[PDB]
């Protein structure tokens, strides 16, 4: 559960970057 | 006045009412209203970082209908 | 582990996007 968190923030961190 | 999407990563968009001085404890308080997810449940993400509680949409150059990330957290 | 996999594959296709 604990690696998922982290990978799913990286993921929504980059989503929003690409947007910017 | 204007209103912000939040997006999941689930490919769901969430449409909120907000204000530009709105905190971000607010709008996670909003997310709860459409969603049911707990605020210290919620992760916001815009322009490439996590939101703090204490700032304002203003703060983060939130704009209309700007597009933040929700992560759920534990 | 699967869901990590297909994380990660996600992870490596954005940062080819940025
Ligand atoms: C939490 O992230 C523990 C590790 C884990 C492994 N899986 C299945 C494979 O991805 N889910 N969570």
Do not use: C, W
Not at chain 2, 34 to 58: H, M, N, Y
């Amino acid at each position: 559960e604990q690696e998922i968190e982290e990978l799913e923030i990286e993921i929504a961190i980059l989503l929003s970057e690409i947007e910017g | 006045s204007m209103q912000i999407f939040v997006k999941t990563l689930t490919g769901k968009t969430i449409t909120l009412e907000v204000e530009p001085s709105d905190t971000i404890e607010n709008v996670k308080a909003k997310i709860q209203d459409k969603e049911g997810i707990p605020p210290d449940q919620q992760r916001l993400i815009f322009a490439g970082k996590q939101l703090e509680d204490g700032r304002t949409l203003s703060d983060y150059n939130i704009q209309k209908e700007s597009t933040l990330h929700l992560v759920l957290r534990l | 582990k699967q869901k990590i996999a297909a994380l990660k594959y996600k992870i490596a296709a954005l940062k080819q996007k940025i």
